[PDB]
Design a protein that fits this description.
The complex is a heterodimer. By secondary structure, chain A is mainly α. Chain A is built from 2 helices and no strands. Helices cover 30% and strands 0% of the residues of chain A. The chains are: A mainly alpha, B mainly alpha. The chains hardly touch. The structure holds zinc ion (4 copies). One zinc ion (ZN) binds next to helix 2 of chain B. Chain B binds a DNA duplex through strand 1, helix 1 and helix 3.
DNA sequence: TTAGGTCACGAAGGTCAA
DNA sequence: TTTGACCTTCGTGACCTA
């Protein structure tokens, strides 16, 4: 179970169980130091279906659920 | 030998001695590969994490350095030579 | 006694078809 | 230009023979 979007979990990654999606999105995010801006209240609901709704809140949750940046290379 | 079955690297349960120090079956495997491969670990932190049965795999550089401080010796690691050799003599003596 | 050999598992990387 | 299902490496360690 992915502590981020919920969808199936390939297994832990950068410190947290997570789907393949939330893995790539978190890698790409770091390796490129991308920065997103929240379209609304910054507490958007993140799940399998609407995990792409807001990049800011997605990534943000990743950190929140404990994903480490230095775990990425 | 009667000395506590506790690994001096990670506090895990030790299965005895390995390359001259009381260690878990995991740190043994580690310490050897490390030397045989001549690896160069470098600790992100300030070179001083605490090795534990659970975090160990976190910072290799420190694990290794720790292996080394509790006395593990490379001396005890068979060369590539030694091995091939024995492996052979024994194998030939399979001659039936 | 411990040594090396196994090898089934992570967990990091990467590829590219949509 | 992002996704994410899939695939590639390789370090791990529990077990085992000797
Ligand atoms: Zn997810
Ligand atoms: Zn948002
Ligand atoms: Zn140990
Ligand atoms: Zn360290």
């Amino acid at each position: 179970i992915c502590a981020i979007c919920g969808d199936r979990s390939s297994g832990k990654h950068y410190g947290v169980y997570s789907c393949e999606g939330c893995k790539g999105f978190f890698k790409r995010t770091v390796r490129k130091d991308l920065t997103y801006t929240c379209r609304d209240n910054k507490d958007c609901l993140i799940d399998k279906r609407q995990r792409n709704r807001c990049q800011y809140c997605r990534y943000q949750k990743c950190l929140a659920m404990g994903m480490k940046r230095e775990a990425v290379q | 030998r009667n000395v506590p079955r506790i690994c001096g690297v990670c506090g895990d349960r030790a299965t005895g001695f390995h390359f001259n120090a009381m260690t878990c079956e995991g740190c043994k495997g580690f310490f050897r590969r490390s030397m045989k491969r001549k690896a160069l670990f470098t600790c992100a932190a300030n070179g001083d994490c605490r090795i534990t049965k659970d975090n160990r795999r976190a910072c290799q550089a420190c694990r290794l350095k720790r292996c080394v401080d509790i006395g593990m010796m490379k001396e005890f690691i068979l060369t590539d030579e030694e091995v091939q050799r024995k492996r052979e003599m024994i194998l030939k003596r399979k001659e039936e």
